[PDB]
From Swiss-Prot:
Bridged cysteine pairs (disulfide): none
Lineage: superkingdom: Archaea
Annotated protein name in UniProt: Uncharacterized ATP-binding protein MJECL15
Protein source organism: Methanocaldococcus jannaschii (strain ATCC 43067 / DSM 2661 / JAL-1 / JCM 10045 / NBRC 100440) (Methanococcus jannaschii)
Chain segments annotated as transmembrane: none
Family classification: Belongs to the archaeal ATPase family.
Amino acid sequence: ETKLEEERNHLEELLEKVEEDYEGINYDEVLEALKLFKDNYELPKSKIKRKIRIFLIKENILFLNPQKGTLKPQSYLVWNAIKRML
């Protein structure tokens, strides 16, 4: 899976940045956020802290549907990288 290890390396890279580098984002809260998605593909956006949602959206991991007020992985590739890594 070139395709899936691309997004796996995307999530990997993002996760490294978050632990080491982003003093603004708690790694462990990012993990707990993303893990929600292993059980449920789409979910209310209030399930996750704003700062974190904003970040994960900015970083193309999650998509916000403003009409439905839900979050979900930006693609199935992302979703599968979550399942596999978290």
